[PDB]
Design a protein around this ligand. Structure first.
Ligand SMILES: CC(=O)N[C@H]1[C@H](O[C@@H]2[C@H](O[C@]3(C(=O)O)C[C@H](O)[C@@H](NC(C)=O)[C@H]([C@H](O)[C@H](O)CO)O3)[C@@H](O)[C@H](O)O[C@@H]2CO)O[C@H](CO)[C@H](O)[C@@H]1O[C@@H]1O[C@H](CO)[C@H](O)[C@H](O[C@]2(C(=O)O)C[C@H](O)[C@@H](NC(C)=O)[C@H]([C@H](O)[C@@H](CO)O[C@]3(C(=O)O)C[C@H](O)[C@@H](NC(C)=O)[C@H]([C@H](O)[C@H](O)CO)O3)O2)[C@H]1O
Ligand SMILES: CC(=O)N[C@H]1[C@H](O[C@@H]2[C@H](O[C@]3(C(=O)O)C[C@H](O)[C@@H](NC(C)=O)[C@H]([C@H](O)[C@H](O)CO)O3)[C@@H](O)[C@H](O)O[C@@H]2CO)O[C@H](CO)[C@H](O)[C@@H]1O[C@@H]1O[C@H](CO)[C@H](O)[C@H](O[C@]2(C(=O)O)C[C@H](O)[C@@H](NC(C)=O)[C@H]([C@H](O)[C@@H](CO)O[C@]3(C(=O)O)C[C@H](O)[C@@H](NC(C)=O)[C@H]([C@H](O)[C@H](O)CO)O3)O2)[C@H]1O
Ligand SMILES: CC(=O)N[C@H]1[C@H](O[C@@H]2[C@H](O)[C@@H](O)[C@H](O)O[C@@H]2CO)O[C@H](CO)[C@H](O)[C@@H]1O[C@@H]1O[C@H](CO)[C@H](O)[C@H](O[C@]2(C(=O)O)C[C@H](O)[C@@H](NC(C)=O)[C@H]([C@H](O)[C@@H](CO)O[C@]3(C(=O)O)C[C@H](O)[C@@H](NC(C)=O)[C@H]([C@H](O)[C@H](O)CO)O3)O2)[C@H]1O
Ligand SMILES: CC(=O)N[C@H]1[C@H](O[C@@H]2[C@H](O)[C@@H](O)[C@H](O)O[C@@H]2CO)O[C@H](CO)[C@H](O)[C@@H]1O[C@@H]1O[C@H](CO)[C@H](O)[C@H](O[C@]2(C(=O)O)C[C@H](O)[C@@H](NC(C)=O)[C@H]([C@H](O)[C@@H](CO)O[C@]3(C(=O)O)C[C@H](O)[C@@H](NC(C)=O)[C@H]([C@H](O)[C@H](O)CO)O3)O2)[C@H]1O
Ligand SMILES: CC(=O)N[C@H]1[C@H](O[C@@H]2[C@H](O)[C@@H](O)[C@H](O)O[C@@H]2CO)O[C@H](CO)[C@H](O)[C@@H]1O[C@@H]1O[C@H](CO)[C@H](O)[C@H](O[C@]2(C(=O)O)C[C@H](O)[C@@H](NC(C)=O)[C@H]([C@H](O)[C@@H](CO)O[C@]3(C(=O)O)C[C@H](O)[C@@H](NC(C)=O)[C@H]([C@H](O)[C@H](O)CO)O3)O2)[C@H]1O
Lengths: 283, 278, 278, 278, 278
């Protein structure tokens, strides 16, 4: 694809917006606040391996990637034309919303005074993971796991075995180029398995950060004044193949810890995207 | 006043206004008495905890809320509007946290010695300047939390219905405007990134229980409020809206580790200029 | 005095002045005797704690206060004024905190072994350069604190009335000027962002009890003092005011965890030029 | 090609090459079997400790080593050489550390509950791109350490003599080249700043035992490899050398707190251009 | 030559010189024997503590001291002087801190298991490049500290009198020059910001007892030594002075938590140019 001039004229630039809700483990339904809906925005209680050779995490304890495909206005009446137009993502304003809610320390989490069961309800703390991507095709994924012996469910999550039709190999604990996928479904690809593939993603920009630990304070900034530029070193943004725009993210804030067996629940927050796009002549 | 034209020139075409917004941590400014509750002003009252997984009823005076003020600008009226160009803002009083001589939980609890533990823990700093109220998006830890119906504005105040599970993530139904001081809890109401076209807001959060508080202050830092097109917030009906919350953490008492939120006041000095509009 | 014109050129139109300000942590410079109290110079005396929720009376020698100096500039005299253009400032002596061979509370309390615990905890660094005293805004942790009525300047010194609940937030009545060294407690008096038009100040605070102290120092960093219009502080009556406080944390003794504040001295090298004024 | 001339223009004058380097934490890639040792690939084997002050004999499979690869470039031959201009490099797989559901030491050891403690502690990230092997300088914690003679390249491998006390500081005798993958221990061999004229390296270290691991990753960051004269690494005999190590910390087992190092793979995409040389 | 003129052009008008300065943590380079004390080279000997508030006598070999070297430049002599333009500097060997397989205090003290605790705690990194010795200002934790009279240069060495209480803050009488390697304790002697007109120095301090050490290293970073007028240090008598200290923290033994300071060597590569002076 040869990238030519910017298209000018009426409606040559557009802005589109979307929010992607977190996918921490509990699905959006049931909505009932007694039947499981109370866990929406969180994982269910993390379940642990029972031995070095018996690690079977439940699907609803595994945070997964959020994604959305946005369909842009059709540009080309005839794809056989020598010169065509594509939507180009120029920039994005993105924000993780709701960090203020972590200031709720009046609930029933493990308390800070364990002698008297007093103090405050311990706020969300621990490992944090924030990634977002904007591209003109699905985010390319590279698999890499802690333990190739982990017995992921065969139904309900897309894992390395889903792709290869074979059990994971020891190479999957490092970089195994066979273990690749595309982020083509929301709430299905676990973030402890699937990472942005630096060997592909030519038509996507992604930005990630990880902070580990168990009691690490969560940190977040938010403003409506920060623009993320999506143009590459040549001044070209992601080009939307068949007018499809792909948004991908995960925003883990840490865990809350309950008063029962120190059970941990992952917490995630929703992410806003406002993408500025322009029409680009291509051949 | 939709089409933004040239800057207005001449006498009184630029103005500076200043204000301080005091924190709204839970204890109201009155009663002033230092024995009848006034001693908690600048702080929350002691945080009260849920009694079960289904019984979380926080008292209003334990919930920090947004501070806000609407300032009236000089009368103006191709019309003219006041345009907010920049702001110098500062959180005042961090030095007061150096008081470690009080009666808080001491650092040596065995012998009741050491120092009075200073304010520590979760911190939250947001400010906004706009030409209309800050647009708010609701999102809570727990849609089952039983907020009081009177004395605070919560999601149910707006919807007239109980919160739903979607309120623990992003539910576009749960929106409000920051139109009252000391009423909108910060654990519920967040700046809405899908609106606020005419407001600039800047926020940061640092969590934890014993995290050291950190603050910088200088009179030399200017925050520019102009957008990508060089246009600042435009003050509808000559009203300028200031919004903030500045939580430094908690102090902890010697009685069952009772926590009190600590907030500090924020200064604003806004430069505004008249703008031609059509 | 008010209208700022061109820079003055010619012989001696620019000058550099330097000063060091020693910390004022609570123990005065005298007695010099290393047995009669002088051993605490550079530090506070042992921090004394409240005996109840209503009885908090800190001793003056436990309260760090602002350091300040007024320097006299060469006589001058459309008139001329000295204008402060820039400053190189440095906090000196952080290397001294590497002394872990003393008699502080040891790191192994089981065997009374390990190292002498180094200075740690809450840190506070502010400096200012101006053409008149630093304007101060009072704000306290506790309006009930019984500060001494002798040997220190507090809110009550200024107002002639006891503190009120508003003094725990921003009370605009509670203002002062930094006009004396070692007299204004830093837990009471903060730079006033509503004034200080003719001063530049820069501050930071890091809290906690065991927080590692952090400091950088170099002779290669210049702080510009010119405002947005290219004008530095103008020295009224040829007086230049320097203000600072540099708290590094506390050391802790082996006797009931008694804490002593540690401060360090700050160097200033100010570059000034003559400015025509009308 | 000592003298560097103009850039070569025309067809095929610029190229991009990519590679990934897997970590070398101690367990080799084979056996592949997940019961026969393959389950430790990407990790070290359990770190074994000294039995006395004079008996420190670490096993080879407990010692992380440098990763390296030599890539062959298109044949070229006033002569031409490949010049590395820039690199995009990324450490892949930090999300895998979010697995806290395994059988590591649990966060609640009193009841054996909570979560599986994630990887924490000392972290070390270095990468280099050059036109010849990375030059290494030896420096160790303890010159008395009894490294194996076979299976690792250590100081004694090079000198044919035991380590001396100078090897605990900078001993210029103790030098080597990174010419083999998975053989040079990172606790011994460091980039040599006195050499490496034709390589660029970038490193950082963060220590401690329970330190939270931190990592950023993006496909939008380019590292320029040009020196102060605008010249990148020149590839001798069309060979491009990539070198790295990326230690994230340790996992800790439920059996006597045995630690295993964790490494992650590093991606490189290098842009090269032809350069005229004389 | 006080007046600085044009740069000198022509053959050999620019030169580049390199050196490494080994750390001076307390144990001298000799004896070399790894049983007779050489095993501590690169480290201090075990830190010895005060026995009372009035009895603090640290041994010389427990006190880290400044490293320094004077390098002789090519002979030169309107005269010419060598001017230091820039320096590439690097602290080498942080990877050696990844040795957690030795006999230090273990991470699991209950069972004496886990890993050998890595170096942690207070860190101090300073370097300087100048045309004369680094100017030093004395400042101590405790003016009562009984430093040895022989084998170290301390305040009393210079003044011929015991330290005074002012030595715990800034006492202008307590000054020296860094004219000897491994002799000036870093807990006493600091770069003097009131002098050093012909030297650039850059320092940082991070305190605490278990703080994770942090270090970055690269061969791509240049430190410019030119002042605000574009003039670098001028080498008096063709002598170039390099000064540094690089403390990474302590290791802790299994015997009564004895601490040993760890230091690392520093590389310098200085670019110099001939300058016309009069
Ligand atoms: C309860 C249990 O042992 N669950 C266990 C499961 O055991 C199977 C059988 O349980 C059920 C069930 O989930 O209730 C019976 C159902 O009929 C069946 N549903 C259907 C549609 O067929 C399901 C279903 O088979 C399965 O869940 C699908 O995976 O199973 C049990 O009766 C029988 O003895 O054994 C059965 C098979 O072993 O088996 C699972 C493995 O297949 C799991 O082992 C499961 O344990 C749960 O695992 C999740 C992670 O997957 C998690 O760790 C969970 O721990 C939490 C949690 O839900 O996240 C941690 C929370 O902190 C904790 N909350 C509080 C406040 O303490 C929460 C509660 O303990 C739950 C446990 O379900 O109790 C409540 C609750 O949420 O508070 C109690 C409420 O009164 C109740 N509401 C009502 C209206 O009754 C809710 C409600 O049922 C659920 O929220 C709906 O999902 O549950 O545990 C860990 O328990
Ligand atoms: C005391 C109590 O049980 N409060 C409790 C409340 O109980 C109701 C009745 O108490 C009162 C009351 O607040 O005193 C009686 C009043 O007549 C009534 N007023 C009116 C106009 O009708 C109020 C009012 O109805 C209610 O507050 C409004 O909701 O109620 C009590 O007599 C009866 O037995 O039960 C009644 C309800 O059934 O009910 C509330 C819920 O409705 C709360 O449960 C409330 O508990 C307080 O809750 C807040 C959070 O909202 C907070 O956790 C508070 O804990 C603190 C605090 O005040 O923040 C934590 C502080 O750290 C702690 N300070 C110290 C130094 O220890 C502080 C003290 O323990 C308070 C307790 O009130 O004692 C002092 C004080 O501030 O130090 C003691 C002083 O001597 C006293 N001053 C004087 C001059 O006497 C002050 C002063 O009363 C108050 O500050 C004024 O507000 O109180 O507690 C937690 O107690
Ligand atoms: C000693 C005492 O009780 N002082 C308190 C004072 O008591 C009054 C009077 O002095 C008593 O004789 C009488 O019984 O009671 C009256 C009451 O009116 O009352 C004051 C209020 O007016 C205070 O309560 C005062 O207590 C002191 O308060 C300060 C804060 O204001 C400190 O908290 C102080 O504690 C320290 C300190 O000096 O900072 C903490 C420090 O860590 C301690 N140092 C050591 C090594 O342990 C010292 C130490 O305990 C002092 C107490 O004064 O003893 C020495 C010293 O080491 O400094 C012992 C020396 O032998 C002595 N020097 C000589 C030559 O004799 C030296 C010297 O007197 C003083 O330093 C000079 O100021 O004191 O305490 C807290 O005690
Ligand atoms: C087993 C043993 O003692 N090994 C040590 C070795 O002993 C020699 C010989 O093997 C013995 O039978 C005999 O008695 O003694 C001779 C020598 O005299 O000698 C070596 C020195 O030459 C070492 O001392 C060695 O000890 C091992 O040293 C390495 C470092 O080099 C590690 O510290 C290792 O500890 C681990 C490890 O493997 O990394 C720590 C780890 O966390 C442990 N894992 C778990 C789940 O607990 C393992 C574990 O204890 C190993 C011990 O080898 O057991 C398994 C395993 O889980 O990995 C058990 C499996 O069932 C087995 N698989 C099969 C199919 O049988 C598996 C497999 O043998 C190995 O992984 C292949 O390498 O081992 O220990 C430390 O033990
Ligand atoms: C041993 C002793 O008591 N030394 C103190 C010295 O005593 C003098 C004399 O040596 C004694 O025989 C006699 O009884 O008393 C006189 C003086 O009255 O006096 C000094 C003051 O003048 C000191 O008090 C000195 O104590 C030593 O002080 C230094 C600081 O100056 C250190 O704190 C030192 O502690 C360490 C150290 O050396 O740094 C801490 C370290 O962690 C320890 N290492 C280990 C592995 O445990 C060592 C260790 O205990 C030393 C003590 O010297 O023993 C060895 C060693 O391991 O280094 C044992 C070796 O076998 C030996 N080698 C040989 C071939 O014999 C080796 C060697 O002598 C020394 O390294 C040479 O310097 O010493 O202690 C603290 O002990």
């Amino acid at each position: 694809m040869e990238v030519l001039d910017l298209v000018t004229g009426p409606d040559s630039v557009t802005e589109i917006e979307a929010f992607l809700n977190p996918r921490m483990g509990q699905p959006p339904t049931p909505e009932s606040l007694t039947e499981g809906g109370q866990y929406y925005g969180w994982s269910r209680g993390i379940n642990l391996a029972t031995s070095d050779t018996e690690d079977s995490p439940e699907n609803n304890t595994l945070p997964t990637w959020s994604m959305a495909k946005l369909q842009l206005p059709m540009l080309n009446e005839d794809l056989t034309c020598d010169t065509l137009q594509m939507w180009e993502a120029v920039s994005v304003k993105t924000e993780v919303v709701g960090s203020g809610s972590l200031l709720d320390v009046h609930g029933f989490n493990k308390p800070t005074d364990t002698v008297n069961t007093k103090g405050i309800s311990t706020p969300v703390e621990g490992s944090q993971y924030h990634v977002f991507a904007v591209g003109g095709e699905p985010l390319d994924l590279q698999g890499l796991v802690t333990d190739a012996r982990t017995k992921y469910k065969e139904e309900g999550v897309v894992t390395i075995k889903t792709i290869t039709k074979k059990d994971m190999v020891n190479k999957d604990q490092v970089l195994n180029p066979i273990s690749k996928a595309k982020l083509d479904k929301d709430g299905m690809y676990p973030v402890e398995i699937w990472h942005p593939d630096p060997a592909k993603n030519e038509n996507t920009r992604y930005f990630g950060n990880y902070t580990g630990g168990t009691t690490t304070p969560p940190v977040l900034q938010f403003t409506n004044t920060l623009t993320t530029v999506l143009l590459d070193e040549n001044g070209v943004g992601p080009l939307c193949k068949g007018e499809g725009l792909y948004l991908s993210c995960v925003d883990i804030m840490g865990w809350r810890v309950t008063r029962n067996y120190d059970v941990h629940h992952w917490r995630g927050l929703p992410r806003y995207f406002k993408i500025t796009l322009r029409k680009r002549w291509v051949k």
